[PDB]
Design a protein around this ligand. Structure first.
Ligand code: ZN
Lengths: 14, 49, 34, 43, 909, 45, 41, 48
């Protein structure tokens, strides 16, 4: 078991 | 059979000049993972994470 | 530098320390989408 | 032109039953050896 | 019998499923309940399915949601037959548990949350005879027998007979020995099967033999057996006939089957899921009663059937099902459209279904059997493409888990007209033609050709050979694809995009009906559930904002009204009155309006004047330059309700408080996050949770935010056109027509040939004509069946009528019909080319790694990459984490930074 | 509290045990070092 | 990156000494990548 | 010229309330509780 185991915003055109 | 033999030779040549003993493959003692690496947020009112 | 050649980014010999492998991988992978 | 000659070697290996004690065994004020888990319940 | 003359209800599937469940499944599961016989000296009983009484809920629906309790119905059965040894029947009505009830719309309220049950598609038990391609020799014909549980038993055929089975681990399972061990005599075995020469030359009961009810029918249909329907066990004659058909297909006498055919697949509904859950709950109840009997005999006390049974298993099983099952999903209450299109979904994935990546590419494509039964347009985009589909409008379950479609007989029979529902397998054998009879070429009118569909193939045949005929316009499309006007002039990709965007619509403050519509918004608003329909006939004697009183034959019925409630996805719900006081009403007519509905029709947007032209590059990409009139005239204003000095004595924020980002109301005190500010309309103290405890974990608060249309918002039409607002301009700066009115929105024209949408121009022109003529249009799809170029005539006639009745010659100009010359707002000069002018129906939308490391390494910014990695992570922390995780498994790591000056090794930890 | 995140523990075992991927896996280094097929050693373990 | 099971087992058995002359090696370590501004000499 | 299919079938009055008791609408959907209580599938609290 051990082996096996900024702001996002829309963009517009200016 | 000859491939097994060549692999055995290659495995045996390493242990002579690598300071790693072959009897360490068994676990006479087991390490324990640190607590924060394990999932533990907090303990409140007998809660166990 | 001489075995690789000219870089299409700036237009001269490749500068020392430029990751040509990542650039090649990306330039081969990105056309596969279209 | 001589390079800066930076040298870093990351080595991997299998631990020994003697080296494993160098991680968990710590000193105490009274001097008793500690580092072993002997109780099943943690909380 | 309903649905043959009109469009069926959108919630009839789940309605009839729940009815069938509560009618037969409960009794079917109680019949298979085992009998526990013990407690000799004590008085007990068994499970007798004789009472079977369900009691109405004490709580009401409104109450349940308010207090977060499930709405459910009690179950009281008097299961008493006879005692163990007392020889006296002790019958007591025991309370087994609670069974959830379904609303008329299909939603069940569990723990205060509206939840729906989505149907599932899966293969049916039977034999299929797939011809697997073989590299050497003839093609190997393997026949797979599917059972009710899901077992697979194959039979292979090599160049020789080589009749072997794949049930065993080895390739050869000795099918001859398997048939001999079944109990049939060898002589009878070789005499029953046809072609005994190759048979003589050739030298489990838990789930495989347990075939379902539909499996026996499918096996009797595919094969030639006449086994009665009561038998549901795999007989040896079945395997004999399977081997016979396989060895016959080896010689060329046979026909392969397609697993993508709807006749080979079965549709599960809420009834089957609830029946399985009830069976599991009954199993748990039997285990519990056995345990408590073993405990009561130990404690040496005569128990009571009331104290012997516990109401825990049923309740906990239904709760776990409604909470953790993939099919059970919460209702989407964004707009009245998502409420009706959520129950019509079909899911290929789920328990006992094909996964996402495991599913082959042949399952996702459209099949000729999906016509009129599954929508070819609606498809969930993403990795789960083709696996989530929508049920067609004219479709129902056909008593065998098969979805059927209506068809009209055009044969010279006794009746001559009968709307038949055809199973996907039975419809293939008839000639189905969708074409008009407006053709005459000096013949009897029956010798004329018409495109028809036969044996999953399209062909043109005479009018004498056609048997069936499809006459409904909305027969092949779902709710979303039907609400698109002029769908014949758009591609299917944009139809899918529009069907997806119509779900993401926001109910605005004031709603307006569309000038150009498809005619299905009426039934959509009827089946939505947000409209108050009358349950009795009578006069309206008292009209008020809170309730409506309807007086019929002496009895007075009170009807509440939703006033500024919150949905599941932050959308306000409100109902307005539409009937004055003192008028007569009938059952089924509207008494009060609803959100996103006006006059009994779906209203998800407003009508705005739109021009298609490039404007200073603000719409180079998909972008819209709107006018400022939409901001101060309250056109695209909407409400949103979110739940979580102004603090009172107790600490809760009082009503009417205007919270701001950073203000606290009740870490210790809850604070409003960034971007959330509005009026606190109401606060409720959840002192008692209903989670079986009184948990004042927190007090629910509601804030109202009236979001005006601003830059960055996404506006979309019903034809796939999508645009992001780029700039707001005053009324004086927008382009103005020859009448003197400034346009509201400006769209880019270059998108029209890119996304292949033509219906938007028709919609704009017809909406302008209707706005000038004060008319509304409801057009059925595919109007070209009447005549060629029907939409052109329909649009141009109305345009010319609006131009001649009202003296506006700029509306219809003969030189370029549908286009008009406009002016510039800044300089007042006309553009050198005409532009499209119209009033379309615009909707407001709700939505407003390793590759980066590879790119940064390609640029050569090592310090920026190091800073980004240290910011994302926080010797570094990642190295310590990795070395700890590796040494937890007996693995040692060292950095060993070697110095090049003095030649010494320094370990860094 | 980073000392707690960096500190580890150790447990003594009365009977020795063998690594997971040193034996069961297809490359059996112990079997290659002991000149004996996997059947007997699996048995001893 | 692919096996993560035997590539570590054989490496720990051989006692391999790895010189950080790659990119993703230093990325996983956390130091400066010897590409571009990091490439000295 | 004039279309073959009459346009009057498409024209709808703007200020018009849809009458759902029409030839092109299904029967009113009754409440599930009342529908199942009339047919005898569910018994009331008093009668129980
Ligand atoms: Zn058309």
């Amino acid at each position: 078991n051990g082996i096996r185991g900024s702001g996002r915003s829309v963009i517009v055109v200016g | 059979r000859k491939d097994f033999l060549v692999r055995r030779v290659e495995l045996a040549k390493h242990f002579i000049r690598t300071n790693i003993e072959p009897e360490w493959m068994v676990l006479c003692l087991l390490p324990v993972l640190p607590p924060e690496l394990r999932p533990i947020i907090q303990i409140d009112g007998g809660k166990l994470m | 530098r001489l075995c690789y050649g000219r870089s299409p980014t700036h237009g001269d010999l490749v500068e020392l320390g430029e990751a040509v492998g990542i650039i090649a991988g990306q330039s081969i992978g990105e056309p596969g989408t279209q | 032109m001589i390079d800066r000659y930076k040298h870093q070697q990351l080595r991997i290996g299998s631990v020994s039953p003697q080296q494993i004690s160098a991680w968990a065994t710590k000193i105490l004020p009274n001097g008793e050896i500690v580092g072993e888990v002997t109780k099943p319940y943690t909380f | 019998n309903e649905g043959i003359s009109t469009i069926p209800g959108f919630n009839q599937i789940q309605f009839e499923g729940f009815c069938r469940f509560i009618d037969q499944g409960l009794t079917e599961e109680l019949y298979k309940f085992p009998k526990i016989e013990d407690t000799d000296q004590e008085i007990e009983f068994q499970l007798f399915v004789e009472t079977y009484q369900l009691v109405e809920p004490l709580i009401k629906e409104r109450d349940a949601v308010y207090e977060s309790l499930t709405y459910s119905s009690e179950l009281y059965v008097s299961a008493g037959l006879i005692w163990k040894n007392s020889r006296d029947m002790q019958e007591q009505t025991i309370f087994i548990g609670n069974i959830p009830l379904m609303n008329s719309l299909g939603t069940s309220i569990v723990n205060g949350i509206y939840r729906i049950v989505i149907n599932q598609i899966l293969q049916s038990p039977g034999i299929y005879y797939r011809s697997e391609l073989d590299h050497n020799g003839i093609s190997v014909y393997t026949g797979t027998i599917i059972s009710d549980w899901g077992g697979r038993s194959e039979l292979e055929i090599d160049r020789k007979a080589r009749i072997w089975a794949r049930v065993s681990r080895k390739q050869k399972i000795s099918i001859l020995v398997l048939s001999s061990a079944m109990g049939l005599n060898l002589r009878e075995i070789l005499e029953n099967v046809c072609y005994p020469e190759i048979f003589l030359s050739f030298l489990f009961f838990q789930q495989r033999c347990e075939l379902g009810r539909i499996g026996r029918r499918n096996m009797n249909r595919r094969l030639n057996l006449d086994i009665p329907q009561n038998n549901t066990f795999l007989l040896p004659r079945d395997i004999l006939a399977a081997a016979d058909h396989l060895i016959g297909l080896k010689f060329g006498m046979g026909a392969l089957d397609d697993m993508n055919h709807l006749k080979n697949k079965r549709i599960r509904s809420v009834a089957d899921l609830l029946q399985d859950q009830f069976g599991l709950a009954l199993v748990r109840l039997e285990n519990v009663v056995r345990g408590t009997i073993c405990g009561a005999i130990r404690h040496k006390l005569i128990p009571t059937p009331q104290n012997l049974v516990t109401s825990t298993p049923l309740t906990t099983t239904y709760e776990s099902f409604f909470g953790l099952h993939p099919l059970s999903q919460v209702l989407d209450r964004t707009n009245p459209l998502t409420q009706i299109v959520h129950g019509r979904k079909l899911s290929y994935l789920g328990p006992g279904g094909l996964t996402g990546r495991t599913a082959s590419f042949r399952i996702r494509d459209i099949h000729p059997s999906h016509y009129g039964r599954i929508c070819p347009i609606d498809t969930s985009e993403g990795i789960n493409v083709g696996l989530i589909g929508s049920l067609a409008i004219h479709a129902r379950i056909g008593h065998w888990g098969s979805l059927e479609s209506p068809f009209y007989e055009i044969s010279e029979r006794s009746t001559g007209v009968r709307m038949l529902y055809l199973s996907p397998g039975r419809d293939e054998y008839y000639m189905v033609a969708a074409g008009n009879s407006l053709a005459l070429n000096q013949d009897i009118q029956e010798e004329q050709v018409v495109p028809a569909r036969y044996r999953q193939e399209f062909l043109t045949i005479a009018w004498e050979q056609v048997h069936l005929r499809s006459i409904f316009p909305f027969q092949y499309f779902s709710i979303g694809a039907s609400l698109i006007p002029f769908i014949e002039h758009n591609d299917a990709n944009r139809a899918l995009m529009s069907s997806n965007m119509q779900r993401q619509a926001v109910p605005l403050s004031r709603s307006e009906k569309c000038i150009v519509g498809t005619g299905l918004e009426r039934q959509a608003a009827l089946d939505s559930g947000a409209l108050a329909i009358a349950e009795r006939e009578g006069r309206v004697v008292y009209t008020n904002t809170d309730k409506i009183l309807l007086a019929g034959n002496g009895d007075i019925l009170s009807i509440p009204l939703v006033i500024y409630q919150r949905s599941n996805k932050n959308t306000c719900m409100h109902q307005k009155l539409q009937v004055p006081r003192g008028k007569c009403i009938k059952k089924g007519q509207i008494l009060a309006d609803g959100a996103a509905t006006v006059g009994g029709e779906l209203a998800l947007g407003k009508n705005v004047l739109v021009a298609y032209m490039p404007w200073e590059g603000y719409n180079s990409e998909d972008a819209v330059l709107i006018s400022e009139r939409l901001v101060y005239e309250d056109i695209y204003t909407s409400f949103h309700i979110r739940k979580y000095r102004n603090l009172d004595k107790n600490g809760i924020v009082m009503l009417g408080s205007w919270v701001e980002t950073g203000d606290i109301l009740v870490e210790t005190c809850l604070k409003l996050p960034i971007g959330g500010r509005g009026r606190v309309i109401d606060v409720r103290w959840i002192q008692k949770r209903g989670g079986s405890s009184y948990n004042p974990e927190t007090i629910r608060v509601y804030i109202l935010q009236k979001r005006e249309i601003k830059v960055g918002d996404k506006v979309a039409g019903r034809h796939g056109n999508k645009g992001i607002i780029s700039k707001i301009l005053p009324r004086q700066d927008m382009p103005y027509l020859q009448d003197g009115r400034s346009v509201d929105m400006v769209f880019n024209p270059l998108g029209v040939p890119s996304r292949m949408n033509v219906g938007q121009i028709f919609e704009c022109s017809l909406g302008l004509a209707g706005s000038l003529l004060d008319r509304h249009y409801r057009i059925a799809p595919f109007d070209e069946r009447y005549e060629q170029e029907a939409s052109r005539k329909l649009v141009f006639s109305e345009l010319y009528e609006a131009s001649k009745q009202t003296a506006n010659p700029w509306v219809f100009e003969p030189e370029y019909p549908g286009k008009s010359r406009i002016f510039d707002g800044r300089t007042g000069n006309p553009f050198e080319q005409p532009v499209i002018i119209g009033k379309p129906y615009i909707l407001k939308l709700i939505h407003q790694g390793e590759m980066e490391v590879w790119a940064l390494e390609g640029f050569g910014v090592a310090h920026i990459l190091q800073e980004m990695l240290t910011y994302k992570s926080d010797a570094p922390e990642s190295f310590r984490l990795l070395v700890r995780e590796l040494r937890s498994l007996a693995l040692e790591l060292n950095h060993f930074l070697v110095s090049e000056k003095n030649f010494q090794i320094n370990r860094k930890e | 509290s980073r000392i707690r995140r960096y500190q580890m523990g150790y447990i003594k075992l009365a009977c020795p045990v063998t690594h997971v991927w040193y034996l069961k896996r297809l490359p059996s280094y112990i079997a290659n070092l002991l000149d004996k097929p996997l059947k007997e050693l699996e048995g001893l373990v | 990156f692919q096996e993560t099971a035997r590539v570590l087992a054989k490496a720990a058995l051989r006692g391999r000494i790895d010189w950080l002359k790659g990119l993703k090696e230093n990325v996983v370590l956390g130091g400066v990548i010897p590409v571009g501004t990091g490439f000295k000499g | 010229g004039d279309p073959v299919y009459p346009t009057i079938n498409y024209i709808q009055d703007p200020d018009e309330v849809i009458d759902y008791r029409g030839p092109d609408f299904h029967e009113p959907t009754p409440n599930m509780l009342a529908y199942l209580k009339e047919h005898g599938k569910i018994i009331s609290r008093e009668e129980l």
